[PDB]
Amino acid sequence: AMYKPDLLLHLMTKEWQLLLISVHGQVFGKGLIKAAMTTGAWIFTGGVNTGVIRHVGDALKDHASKGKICTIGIAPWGIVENQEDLIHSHFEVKLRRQLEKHISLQKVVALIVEVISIVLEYLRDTPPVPVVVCDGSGRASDILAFGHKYSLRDQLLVTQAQHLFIILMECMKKKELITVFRMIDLAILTALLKGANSAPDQLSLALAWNRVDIARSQIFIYGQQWPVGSLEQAMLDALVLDRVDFVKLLIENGVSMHRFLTISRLEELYNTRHGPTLYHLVRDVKPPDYRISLIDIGLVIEYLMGGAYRCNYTRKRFRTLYHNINHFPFPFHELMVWAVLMKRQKMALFFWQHGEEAMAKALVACKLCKAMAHEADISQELNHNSRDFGQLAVELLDQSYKQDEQLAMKLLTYELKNWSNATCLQLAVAAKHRDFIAHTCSQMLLTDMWMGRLRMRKNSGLKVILGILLPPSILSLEFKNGRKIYEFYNAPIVKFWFYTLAYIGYLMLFNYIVLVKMERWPSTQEWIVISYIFTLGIEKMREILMSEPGKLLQKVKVWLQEYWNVTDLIAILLFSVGMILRLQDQPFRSDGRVIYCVNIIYWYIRLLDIFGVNKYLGPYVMMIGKMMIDMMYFVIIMLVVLMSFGVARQAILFPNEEPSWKLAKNIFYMPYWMIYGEVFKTGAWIVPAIMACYLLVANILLVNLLIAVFNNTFFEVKSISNQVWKFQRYQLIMTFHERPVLPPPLIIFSHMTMIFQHDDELKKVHDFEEQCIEEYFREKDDRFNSSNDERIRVTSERVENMSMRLEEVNEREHSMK
Ligand SMILES: CC(=O)[C@H]1CC[C@H]2[C@@H]3CC=C4C[C@@H](OS(=O)(=O)O)CC[C@]4(C)[C@H]3CC[C@]12C
Numbered sequence: 001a002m003y004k005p006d007l008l009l010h011l012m013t014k015e016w017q018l019l020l021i022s023v024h025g026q027v028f029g030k031g032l033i034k035a036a037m038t039t040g041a042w043i044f045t046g047g048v049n050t051g052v053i054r055h056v057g058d059a060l061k062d063h064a065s066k067g068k069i070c071t072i073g074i075a076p077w078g079i080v081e082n083q084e085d086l087i088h089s090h091f092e093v094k095l096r097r098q099l100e101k102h103i104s105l106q107k108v109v110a111l112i113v114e115v116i117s118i119v120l121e122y123l124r125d126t127p128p129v130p131v132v133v134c135d136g137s138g139r140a141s142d143i144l145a146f147g148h149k150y151s152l153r154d155q156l157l158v159t160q161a162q163h164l165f166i167i168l169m170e171c172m173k174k175k176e177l178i179t180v181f182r183m184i185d186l187a188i189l190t191a192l193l194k195g196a197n198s199a200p201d202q203l204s205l206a207l208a209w210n211r212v213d214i215a216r217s218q219i220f221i222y223g224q225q226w227p228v229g230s231l232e233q234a235m236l237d238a239l240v241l242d243r244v245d246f247v248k249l250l251i252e253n254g255v256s257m258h259r260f261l262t263i264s265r266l267e268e269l270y271n272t273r274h275g276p277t278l279y280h281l282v283r284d285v286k287p288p289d290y291r292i293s294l295i296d297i298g299l300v301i302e303y304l305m306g307g308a309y310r311c312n313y314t315r316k317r318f319r320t321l322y323h324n325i326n327h328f329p330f331p332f333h334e335l336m337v338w339a340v341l342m343k344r345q346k347m348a349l350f351f352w353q354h355g356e357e358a359m360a361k362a363l364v365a366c367k368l369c370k371a372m373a374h375e376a377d378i379s380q381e382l383n384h385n386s387r388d389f390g391q392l393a394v395e396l397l398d399q400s401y402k403q404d405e406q407l408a409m410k411l412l413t414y415e416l417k418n419w420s421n422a423t424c425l426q427l428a429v430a431a432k433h434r435d436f437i438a439h440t441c442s443q444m445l446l447t448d449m450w451m452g453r454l455r456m457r458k459n460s461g462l463k464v465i466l467g468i469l470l471p472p473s474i475l476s477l478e479f480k481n482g483r484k485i486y487e488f489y490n491a492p493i494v495k496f497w498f499y500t501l502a503y504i505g506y507l508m509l510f511n512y513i514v515l516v517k518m519e520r521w522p523s524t525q526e527w528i529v530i531s532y533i534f535t536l537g538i539e540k541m542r543e544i545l546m547s548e549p550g551k552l553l554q555k556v557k558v559w560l561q562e563y564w565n566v567t568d569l570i571a572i573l574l575f576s577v578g579m580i581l582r583l584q585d586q587p588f589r590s591d592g593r594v595i596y597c598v599n600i601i602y603w604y605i606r607l608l609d610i611f612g613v614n615k616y617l618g619p620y621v622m623m624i625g626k627m628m629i630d631m632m633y634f635v636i637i638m639l640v641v642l643m644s645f646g647v648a649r650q651a652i653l654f655p656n657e658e659p660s661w662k663l664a665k666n667i668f669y670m671p672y673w674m675i676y677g678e679v680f681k682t683g684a685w686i687v688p689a690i691m692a693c694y695l696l697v698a699n700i701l702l703v704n705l706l707i708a709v710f711n712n713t714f715f716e717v718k719s720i721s722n723q724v725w726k727f728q729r730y731q732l733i734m735t736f737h738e739r740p741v742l743p744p745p746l747i748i749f750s751h752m753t754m755i756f757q758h759d760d761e762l763k764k765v766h767d768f769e770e771q772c773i774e775e776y777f778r779e780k781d782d783r784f785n786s787s788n789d790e791r792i793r794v795t796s797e798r799v800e801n802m803s804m805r806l807e808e809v810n811e812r813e814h815s816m817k
């Protein structure tokens with residue numbers, strides 16, 4: 001601790017380097033310390049520990065160490081027992097007065113503990129006089145009695161009398177100036193507010209305090225001024241600040257967000273740095289302190305969302321309009337987007353508590369959180385923020401299904417003008433939130449879509465196979481379970497079976513072609529295969545062409561994300577090259593045949609991407625994909641172990657040898673029978689036997705290690721494959737549904753046909769969503785309040801208070817008797 005108003009204050013502050021509080025003289029004391037610590041106002045108290053300071057110090061030792069409030073301790077120098085030591089922290093009266101005046105000057109609280117003349121002089125001098133009432137007897141007690149009474153002279157004489165009467169009259173002259181204290185933080189806040197004495201100034205002081213509960217009492221009053229313009233600035237400051245209860249009070253105070261929302265205000269909010277990766281991300285997507293506008297924010301939003309996405313504000317027309325009402329029809333959407341952008345979670349939760357199309361916003365937030373984490377505390381927010389948003393969306397879906405299955409199904413799928421017309425399912429898939437898709441309602445909708453118009457659900461595979469095999473007879477009956485045949489064909493399941501059968505036929509023809517013979521000119525089967533590939537290429541080019549979003553230049557970039565499509569293109573190119581080489585005479589025909597012979601391997605393996613649909617078949621594919629990398633890593637160990645012994649054995653043998661580029665085969669031969677025979681002057685025979693035995697042991701060791709590795713990996717994969725399988729169904733269904741009805745070799749005519757061809761419900765849905773969210777909040781609150789842990793705490797607190805009251809009442813009963 002460190003030990004002429006201006007000069008004295010400067011000297012005291014220099015050594016210590018530290019409104020106002022001053023004490024002149026358990027729960028209340030603790031509350032006062034908490035208020036002082038929160039405000040940070042230095043407490044002016046006597047420097048002598050004994051007396052009132054002892055009571056002050058008892059509470060100070062309670063929680064001072066547990067901000068280090070710069071309490072001011074002033075005591076006479078002569079009182080110091082040791083002069084050398086004399087020469088609380090930063091350790092006369094006029095100095096305090098002028099220090100208070102200086103503090104008040106910049107854009108003054110006194111507490112009495114057990115004096116009256118000093119209080120009166122301070123009240124007269126300083127414009128404010130908010131003296132804190134003192135329960136202890138003395139001059140403060142007399143002042144409090146005089147203030148309450150506003151008879152008195154006789155009592156004062158019974159308890160000098162003339163001086164007391166004069167002091168009481170002087171206090172009455174400044175009646176209501178002295179702070180009234182009655183059995184603490186709220187009372188202190190009210191006293192400080194009264195001492196400060198414009199409505200915007202009071203609102204700013206309350207916001208600075210941040211005590212929403214205390215601030216409400218001061219702000220809440222009738223016949224207030226509320227000058228125009230102050231409310232907007234206060235709301236802007238509150239939104240910039242992390243305070244939430246203040247914003248809620250503004251909303252309940254009559255402040256309209258729709259009226260508040262404006263382009264300039266939002267731009268200033270976005271470009272502000274007064275708060276807790278937006279800048280770096282914007283710079284990368286897009287210039288220090290560069291003026292950020294809605295256009296750039298929308299552009300970075302679209303960047304983060306992914307390809308084939310759009311934003312209502314993130315569009316060229318919006319940018320042109322901004323460059324050239326000016327009120328967002330749905331301010332909550334933009335506010336929530338910003339709140340999640342700047343990593344403000346509680347405000348995002350509150351905004352989501354009140355909004356239209358909450359489920360869509362929640363899924364977008366989960367997508368944004370994951371994307372931000374991947375692009376980039378980052379691990380912490382990714383695990384919590386994105387997961388929490390997804391869980392909220394799942395809970396909302398579950399509640400809606402309970403309230404109404406049909407309405408939940410309808411809500412799941414409907415165009416959103418705000419979000420570039422993307423349904424909830426598409427957003428969930430983009431976010432890869434398997435939980436949302438795994439829900440019963442989503443699976444039911446996917447099954448209904450997959451079955452198409454036909455309602456059959458028993459022996460579906462056999463029925464589809466029969467319908468494909470026997471159209472004219474099957475279709476008429478299958479329609480119940482003309483137009484019936486057409487709607488049967490248009491169903492995705494029959495398209496899937498049609499494509500599967502066509503692919504099987506193509507495979508059989510390919511096997512028959514390459515496997516037998518070759519001639520100068522290709523046979524009919526090779527022509528059929530070439531037609532297959534040509535039609536498939538036409539289909540791929542058409543699919544890319546219909547992938548219009550992003551224009552022609554930016555359509556291929558998104559379309560290229562899928563690996564299987566790129567592999568298909570590569571295989572098509574290699575097949576075409578091989579076919580071209582085939583018709584180049586015998587010397588080139590023989591060399592080119594092998595290329596498209598090897599090309600068959602890709603087509604046989606492409607069925608794996610289609611074998612993930614089945615419930616019992618996808619786990620095998622997933623396990624293979626997982627174990628590929630494990631085998632890759634195992635190969636290194638296998639080589640390191642085996643090659644050493646192989647090289648040693650080879651070197652021991654063939655002492656005289658020439659390289660001839662033919663040692664790799666010798667080392668890598670690794671024969672079992674030959675080594676075993678080699679196993680069974682003296683040392684030259686012993687050493688090779690030892691080498692052979694070591695190799696033989698190592699082989700089986702590695703084999704068993706591989707077996708164990710595969711078993712463990714398969715178990716780990718199977719623990720999750722069942723849950724994972726459901727996700728791919730939506731992709732498959734939405735893929736086959738869009739595709740035309742004819743097989744790949746026959747869609748050539750399909751393209752010809754294509755060329756030849758060329759609000760109350762919304763209000764009800766909004767009301768249902770509002771009711772669902774309100775019910776969710778009510779249920780959450782009721783369940784939490786009914787928890788045993790909370791009830792036990794409540795009972796314990798009530799018991800303590802009830803017991804204390806009973807004990808006090810016991811003394812009264814004894815006195816009465
Ligand atoms: C681990 C091994 O044992 C391998 C790894 C690198 C291999 C070497 C690569 C370079 C050549 C050049 C060649 O000369 S030449 O006239 O035949 O071209 C002879 C063969 C030789 C010496 C190979 C011998 C086997 C290796 C040492």
Ligand SMILES: Cc1cc(NC(=O)[C@H](c2ccccc2)N2CCCc3ccccc32)no1
Nearest residue numbers: 499500503506532536539540607610739744
């Ligand atoms: C089983 C199975 C295989 C399969 N193969 C196709 O459907 C189709 C195709 C057609 C002829 C030869 C090779 C492949 N192919 C691959 C995947 C889906 C698709 C989408 C647009 C254009 C082509 C295409 N479907 O189920």
